[PDB]
């Protein structure tokens, strides 16, 4: 019941600042995510689907963002990289699920969608589940930066630029990550 708004949102958030949308104490139906024919990568860890019916409506979380096609398999536990240790890191003992689907003609502009951003440069690779907003210039060891965009030291974000002329691995995949817990 309460996640018909999480999977149907008109616009998703970017990866560098994603939403931690929390569902609450209603009767949850996990037979509308299971038995969905529309999904492509349904990946649920140690708490199995169709066995979490009689469990865990204990402020379940539901993250949501959008990454490119062959990026969606950087989201498993472990799996270090660039959009999994700067942007969205989930722990090595991850419990619940990760659901992601192919937005072919819902997020791709023929000129290029240039407002889906992912972080590029960040010291001290990111802790689990921690969200950033702050955009500061990087300071990679050189002369002390103060808003410069010069040699070797520049902006930390970078747009995606989706197009319908891409292959499979570049057209955007919206990712919804579920996670369960107890008291």
């Amino acid at each position, epitope marked *: 019941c309460p996640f018909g708004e999480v999977f149907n949102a008109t616009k998703f958030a970017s990866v560098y600042a994603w939403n931690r949308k929390r569902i609450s104490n209603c009767v949850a139906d996990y037979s509308v995510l299971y038995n969905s024919a529309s999904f492509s990568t*349904f990946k649920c860890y140690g708490v*199995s689907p169709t066995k979490l019916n009689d469990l865990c409506f204990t402020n379940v979380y539901a993250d949501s963002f959008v990454i490119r096609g062959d990026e969606v398999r950087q989201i498993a536990p*472990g799996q*270090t990289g660039k959009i999994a240790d700067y942007n969205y890191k989930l722990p090595d003992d991850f419990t619940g699920c990760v659901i992601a689907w192919n937005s072919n003609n819902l997020d791709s502009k023929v000129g290029g969608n240039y407002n889906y951003l992912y972080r590029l440069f960040r010291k001290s690779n990111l802790k689990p589940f921690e969200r950033d907003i702050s955009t500061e210039i990087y300071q990679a060891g050189s002369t002390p930066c103060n808003g410069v965009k010069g040699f070797n030291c520049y902006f930390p974000l970078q747009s995606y630029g989706f197009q319908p002329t891409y292959g499979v691995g570049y057209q955007p995949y919206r990712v919804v990550v579920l996670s369960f817990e107890l008291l």
Partner: antibody
Amino acid sequence: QVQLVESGGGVVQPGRSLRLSCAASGFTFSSIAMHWVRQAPGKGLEWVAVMSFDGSIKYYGDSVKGRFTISRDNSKSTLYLQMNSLRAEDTAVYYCARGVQGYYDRSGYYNLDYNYGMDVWGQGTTVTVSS
Amino acid sequence: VLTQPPSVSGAPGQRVTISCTGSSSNIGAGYDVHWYQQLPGTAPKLLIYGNSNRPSGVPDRFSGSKSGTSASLAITGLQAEDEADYYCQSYDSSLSGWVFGGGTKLTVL
């Protein structure tokens, strides 16, 4: 830090066998599915065996099927590869490589017919079958 | 297996492609191909997984692709360090094995 140290080096007869010991420390060993992958000297790598986080799902390579076996012990957190009828073409150096934690398929069917790669690799202990 | 060119070479600072051709029962069926850089004398290190992704430690030069039945570890601006072997690894469904490639031989000039 993580590593995959290993032991069980071999100078043995064509038809007899030995049992490897691929140890592990540092990472969560009880959740992820190790692989065994060999390299005969002169050529490139070749995949040998796989086993899951418990010991249920196991596949093999076509040169090594039915003869070899692979087992896990979560009391000493190691791997073993037993190689009965070690005939002549089965010589290599044997690497044990960490797989992934994967389990999926929304019908309850826990399985791994997977896509991912082998992240951290062993040191390799050379086995030698010689007439 | 997955066929691979036995020997390709290139001067420092160029862009050298490394092909990896497969059938329809493997990489062409929808399974991804990875890339390992095995220096002669050690264990192969994971370079690309899932056709585009680079872990922490591998630099920004190693770009991979996958289209049709192929792959390309495009090394751009190669230095005097990366002259090792490169193996592409799919997982086929005809024999359910995690099949590797024959192995290329890249040396700088």
